[PDB]
Amino acid sequence: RVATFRKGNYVADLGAMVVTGLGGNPMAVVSKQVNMELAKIKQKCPLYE
DNA sequence: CGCGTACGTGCGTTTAAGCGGTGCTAGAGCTGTCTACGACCAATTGAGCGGCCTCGGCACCGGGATTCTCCAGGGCGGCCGCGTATAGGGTCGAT
What we know:
1 chains, 49 residues, alpha+beta, two-stranded antiparallel sheet, 1 helix, extended, DNA-binding, Lysine-specific histone demethylase 1A
């Protein structure tokens, strides 16, 4: 259930890619062990009807 | 200390208090007679007071009912505040 689409320069995850936070997450250890490029997500989400 | 008003003060208008002069008689005050009522004395009698006793109306109280007295706590709104997020600026790397 970890699926990543890879073709040319396009990379998009079809399953899981969003961290639920680093506080108390063993994935932070994983990110320090495996070359993970983590990017913060701004919670601003406008809505269009 | 501050606000609001009610009473002091002045003036023009208006009422009756005061003066006093005069006349009338009602009622106070004086007087003269006659007596009904009160003081005063004596003898008799019971109404009123000290004493003595018994007894219950109320002082005393422990329990129970009540009638106030005070407050205390929970809820609800406001104000401040710690944490997280988000935008902005600055810095570093790449073209």
